[PDB]
Design an enzyme around this catalytic site. Sequence first.
Site, PDB file in Angstrom:
ATOM      1  N   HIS A 224      18.464  10.194  -3.643  1.00  0.00           N
ATOM      2  CA  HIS A 224      18.502  10.601  -2.213  1.00  0.00           C
ATOM      3  C   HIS A 224      19.958  10.609  -1.733  1.00  0.00           C
ATOM      4  O   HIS A 224      20.400  11.608  -1.172  1.00  0.00           O
ATOM      5  CB  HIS A 224      17.657   9.687  -1.301  1.00  0.00           C
ATOM      6  CG  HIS A 224      16.170   9.687  -1.529  1.00  0.00           C
ATOM      7  ND1 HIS A 224      15.474  10.735  -2.139  1.00  0.00           N
ATOM      8  CD2 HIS A 224      15.219   8.776  -1.182  1.00  0.00           C
ATOM      9  CE1 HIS A 224      14.180  10.453  -2.160  1.00  0.00           C
ATOM     10  NE2 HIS A 224      13.994   9.259  -1.568  1.00  0.00           N
ATOM     11  N   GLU A 228      22.218  14.255  -1.151  1.00  0.00           N
ATOM     12  CA  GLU A 228      22.823  14.511   0.168  1.00  0.00           C
ATOM     13  C   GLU A 228      24.334  14.734   0.023  1.00  0.00           C
ATOM     14  O   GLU A 228      24.889  15.720   0.601  1.00  0.00           O
ATOM     15  CB  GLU A 228      22.568  13.342   1.111  1.00  0.00           C
ATOM     16  CG  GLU A 228      23.246  13.586   2.439  1.00  0.00           C
ATOM     17  CD  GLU A 228      22.665  14.788   3.198  1.00  0.00           C
ATOM     18  OE1 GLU A 228      21.415  15.172   2.928  1.00  0.00           O
ATOM     19  OE2 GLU A 228      23.446  15.333   4.065  1.00  0.00           O
ATOM     20  N   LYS A 231      25.186  18.077  -1.804  1.00  0.00           N
ATOM     21  CA  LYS A 231      24.948  19.223  -0.887  1.00  0.00           C
ATOM     22  C   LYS A 231      26.182  19.407  -0.015  1.00  0.00           C
ATOM     23  O   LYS A 231      26.642  20.540   0.129  1.00  0.00           O
ATOM     24  CB  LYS A 231      23.700  19.030  -0.026  1.00  0.00           C
ATOM     25  CG  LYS A 231      22.425  19.590  -0.640  1.00  0.00           C
ATOM     26  CD  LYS A 231      21.116  18.883  -0.270  1.00  0.00           C
ATOM     27  CE  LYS A 231      21.088  18.287   1.123  1.00  0.00           C
ATOM     28  NZ  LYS A 231      19.724  18.232   1.715  1.00  0.00           N
TER      29      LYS A 231
END
Length: 341
Positions: A224, A228, A231
Amino acid sequence: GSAPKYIEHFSKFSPSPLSMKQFLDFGSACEKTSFTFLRQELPVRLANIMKEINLLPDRVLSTPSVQLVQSWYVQSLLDIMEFLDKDPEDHRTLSQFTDALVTIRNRHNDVVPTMAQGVLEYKDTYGDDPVSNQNIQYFLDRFYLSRISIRMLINQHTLIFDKHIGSIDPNCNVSEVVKDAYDMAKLLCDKYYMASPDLEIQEINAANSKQPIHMVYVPSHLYHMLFELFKNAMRATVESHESSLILPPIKVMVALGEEDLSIKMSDRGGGVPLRKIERLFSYMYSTAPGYGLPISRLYAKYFQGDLQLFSMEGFGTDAVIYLKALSTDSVERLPVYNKSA
Ligand SMILES: CC(C)c1ccc(COc2ccc(CC(=O)NCCN)cc2Cl)cc1
Ligand SMILES: CN(C(=O)c1ccc(O)cc1O)c1ccc(C(N)=O)cc1
Ligand SMILES: [Cl-]
């Protein structure tokens, strides 16, 4: 009904933080002990955050998004109560408890976009001043950290009691999770843009040079956070170079110290001025018609870690995930009710 009474009773208790060690033992102890722990501890954690929700000013509390989330918490607390007098030796008690945990988990799946609507409504109905910002940041950090801790407890129970111990990998290969999260971000990046930067990973095992770096961790949490960050680093790199031909790679260092396991992601995406860093972590300023960074930071904080950004405007951005190297230092970080305002 009794929801306010229950909230008042269980908010008298402190949540009990668990270490990785305790988590690993629960998944050897057995199902009955998990049941008797959880039927006390979940009401305690639910009630502590429900009490804090009830302290929000009426103009926040009265809004449909908060009323809706508050109604999920009330039902979930009541679902857990049913089991307080039930007999742990009865295997139907235990299977029904597991079933109840899955419904509770499913019921709360949409909390983040629901709270995000609440933030949007508040910005438009009352404004986006710095004091509003701090109160939103204060509340949601505690709310979301509480919610991470409850999902962890539920996940450990439902996964173990149907090598990995539920959501915990006691031999997590950090570089493998880095490559997975990169590969996924690259996929999306290639689809949306005509290009994607490459990955370079370097490991620094201070004490055991060239020994691959492993830890006890919750790899889904680590994924997770890394996803993030990938990205963000890919969007910056691609967009800042769309008149250039060369695309600098994203460089990840995984460092293992005596007490820290540190993961730095370095990009050359042109960076952010220092003034704008605080805004990237702000639920309020990052809400437009939750978010990745602030919530990724809570995942890091959850086992006594952190997530920091340092940018160099004109060059690029370093993101660092700080984790505890040792399972003995990896203890739940829980927001506790009482003192207030
Ligand atoms: C996430 C959503 C639902 C949300 C939206 C908005 C808020 C904002 O809540 C505020 C805003 C201003 C003040 C100042 C003040 O008046 N102090 C004293 C308190 N009356 C306090 C709070 Cl708790 C929280 C959560
Ligand atoms: C410029 N920029 C950065 O320099 C940057 C910010 C955060 C991060 O983790 C990495 C970055 O390169 C950046 C800013 C905002 C986003 C976003 N939230 O869409 C993405 C990239
Ligand atoms: Cl457990």
